Amino acid sequence: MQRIIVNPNEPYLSVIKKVVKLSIPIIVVNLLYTVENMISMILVSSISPSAVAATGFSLSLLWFIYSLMALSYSGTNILIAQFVGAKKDPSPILINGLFLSFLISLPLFFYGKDFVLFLMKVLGASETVRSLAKEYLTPIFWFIPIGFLTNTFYGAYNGAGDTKTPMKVAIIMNLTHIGTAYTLINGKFGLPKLGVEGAGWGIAISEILAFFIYTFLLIFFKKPFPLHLRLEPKLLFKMVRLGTPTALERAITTLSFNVFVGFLAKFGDKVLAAHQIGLRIESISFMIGFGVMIASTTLAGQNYGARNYRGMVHAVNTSAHFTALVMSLTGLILILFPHYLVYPFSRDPEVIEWASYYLQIVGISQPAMAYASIYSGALKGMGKTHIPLFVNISSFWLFRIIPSYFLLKVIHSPLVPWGFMTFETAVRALFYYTVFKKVVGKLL
Amino acid sequence: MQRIIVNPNEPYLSVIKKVVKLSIPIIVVNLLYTVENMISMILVSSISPSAVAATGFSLSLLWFIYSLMALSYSGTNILIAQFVGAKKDPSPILINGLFLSFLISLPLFFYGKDFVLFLMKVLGASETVRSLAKEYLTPIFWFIPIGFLTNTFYGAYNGAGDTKTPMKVAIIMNLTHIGTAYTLINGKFGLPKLGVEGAGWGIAISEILAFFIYTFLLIFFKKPFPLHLRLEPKLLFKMVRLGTPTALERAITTLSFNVFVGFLAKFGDKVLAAHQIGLRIESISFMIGFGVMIASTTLAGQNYGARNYRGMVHAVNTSAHFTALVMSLTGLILILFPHYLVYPFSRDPEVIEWASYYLQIVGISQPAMAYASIYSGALKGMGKTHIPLFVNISSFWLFRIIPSYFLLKVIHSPLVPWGFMTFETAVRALFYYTVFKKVVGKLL
Ligand SMILES: CCCCCCCC/C=C/CCCCCCCC(=O)OC[C@H](O)CO
């Protein structure tokens, strides 16, 4: 596999061309997932509001336990990028990462469903909503090892620098997901109506199809890399070392976010609904920085593996400036046109005003988020996965949650947590920039 | 601080003398914790069975969230042993480890109680039991940062090789704990009866006293090391890197153990009660291997930091064989006298029969546990904290839980999970030994 080297004095537009080629397929992958989940929500709402509640609770808890996938994703992803940059054969990384992903899926396969329903009992779901959720989750947990394996293929491609092939798989996966769920929920074309169980099968069947395509490309075209059947315990242990802080950051971020949202829950259903609407609107801004973050791990990792440290820094700094310009635009749009963006979601005047204030406050923070996304990705590509764990969790609690806790005792307004959200985002970018300079300085 | 160097050709009895001098105070600390927890349970039983239920649920969930303490414990503990061995000034490690322990406590201080009660509203409690638990947990969470700080003092001593000073603090702490709870529960002297809240204050006040003693020794006698007020972000990040896998191993082990105990819950209350009785009996044998594990981290870390790799290996191998001899004896007691050990716990004939069968099955496994305990502690002292995470969790699921899941479909007997428990303990010892040889082999 050929590397994506960035030369220390490469012109700006030639670096961006490489960044955009990597980043656009990941942004597409992410936006297909957003569109699919929106369509899947409408399909389930054709059943009953208890069905919507069951899948709503299910998806949030599934998102939590999916933190585990970051372990096998990150270890495989980082090491393949570094090996490609060092001109080493990455085939051992691919096979051990897939086996590791399969292994860590097994506790979720054997007892993840009970754990989810257990953690659903807690949130105050009726036993009817939990009984529907158990039907929805049954096919999902039957094939959760397939989900782990396809997520690790995704990481192998991305680290290898071929983000287009997972985008191709994602297009087919997402049509299969929507077509299956639509067919099995409504019982279309002389097929039995399965209810929420049909929405679950849509996830399982699309994952099985993704896995078959990945495996077909592996056996017959040698994937990103040829298949070699040999486990290497030293690589398994290195992948665990790399991926464990990433899995932990995702799990702890979700818990921290639950705490923070509770601050808005105390303002009533309308402030809470506006926060959610503002979040899903803000996440089209999110996916851009998230895709270039993926791309930053590939670029940083490959150039780090090549010991091309000056070119690695050049790639990261150029990427960061470019993504901060793009998100200056998306942020400007959030500040200027919030009533247009909110309009498709609700018509409650009072909800429109809160969500619009949310979008405006956070739109200021979009360029900072771009900086945090890219420096985080660059540190992961260097193998420093414990650094985004420390930066993200310490920033979240010290500059967002705890200041909100104390000032909300004096100022009873949702603008308080929302204002600290944008303050913390700016602080966290400065934090990442500071640590990145010191890390790169020792490297140079 | 002087190092506990082990020379490569040191006579066996001179190595054991060093091991026993380190290990005995830790074993005392652990057994004082066992005696206190028993006395505290009897004090609460003077209130009501719902009070016992509230503290039982509380203590089990507290043990889970205490997984976090391992992050700051392990980072401070390991780096101090290595710095002492390398004859470097460990004062920076002590101060940043305390600050880090304070920091990671803060999310529990602000929302841990709700999380616990959230996580209790599930195990099948009740709003009466949960309302008592909330009274018990209120003083505990008010001073949870003090608990984190005292646990990190404990680790600094242990790594420095002075295990006697925390044993002294533990004696005073445990008397304070029992005297306070007894006073406040029974309303002794001129104090009002506070109910289960009085047991919570017993924890808080004794932790406060332990912290004051530690802090007094720091300021006036220079603790294990003098106080230097300067945070070092580079040390904080290394401590996070070291401690994160240990915290995650503890959290995941607890969850895995919950899955495994559920296999025995399906056999009824009497098979379940016998398993618990067998566990608390096995745990006086546990504390021996656990204390020598702490000592192994100190000995391995200091000799690793001294680059005295042959002496490090010699210390670990001598420690392992000696501890396996000691636990061969404790295991022989479990196999030979189970009805005597069970007698003080229950008089139900079927419970005595199951618990006795548990002790016999388990007694075989005691020398294997000693080997796993010591190799694990040695790998932690070398900074390889991700290895016990990988070895423990993979062994637990692949050789205990999953084989039990399948054979329980054919053989409906508690001997099945209990027999795989001893089988898995033996495999995990061989696993650790294999990994330890390859790690030290490269070192030599
Ligand atoms: C992973 C740590 C973050 C934890 C939470 C971050 C909150 C904001 C998330 C933005 C990502 C895109 C939003 C998608 C959120 C998916 C989780 C979820 O709520 O479940 C699906 C939901 O029901 C259907 O919108």
Ligand SMILES: CCCCCCCC/C=C/CCCCCCCC(=O)OC[C@H](O)CO
């Ligand atoms: C594999 C499909 C079955 C899973 C069901 C949908 C999963 C949502 C998308 C996950 C990867 C895409 C996110 C971009 C890759 C980031 C690294 C990763 O894959 O981790 C997953 C994430 O942390 C989890 O919370």
Ligand SMILES: CCCCCCCC/C=C/CCCCCCCC(=O)OC[C@H](O)CO
């Ligand atoms: C589980 C919760 C996660 C832990 C939350 C507690 C947070 C405490 C703060 C830590 C600061 C660490 C960030 C500082 C990073 C410094 C990295 C660095 O400077 O390294 C440069 C080096 O020269 C190149 O190799």
Ligand SMILES: CCCCCCCC/C=C/CCCCCCCC(=O)OC[C@H](O)CO
């Ligand atoms: C001194 C009071 C400290 C605050 C209250 C603690 C109570 C639990 C006892 C810990 C003794 C330490 C024995 C183990 C030595 C390692 C320290 C540790 O990490 O404890 C975390 C453990 O894994 C949890 O799940």
Ligand SMILES: CCCCCCCC/C=C/CCCCCCCC(=O)OC[C@H](O)CO
């Ligand atoms: C959630 C985590 C659960 C994981 C579930 C599957 C894990 C399977 C892997 C086992 C590898 C253990 C083998 C360790 C290999 C030895 C490491 C080594 O050789 O180290 C040499 C050198 O000293 C550098 O540290």
Ligand SMILES: CCCCCCCC/C=C/CCCCCCCC(=O)OC[C@H](O)CO
């Ligand atoms: C198979 C080879 C080793 C695999 C490596 C493991 C990967 C790490 C898994 C971590 C989460 C464990 C999830 C276990 C399922 C939920 C745990 C649980 O206990 O849920 C029940 C609840 O406690 C009722 O009280």
Ligand SMILES: CCCCCCCC/C=C\CCCCCCCC(=O)OC[C@H](O)CO
């Ligand atoms: C503050 C200083 C910054 C350093 C911070 C490092 C400590 C982070 C480590 C673990 C936090 C785990 C999160 C614990 C918070 C409780 C989570 C919770 O209560 O969530 C409720 C539940 O989600 C409702 O549905």
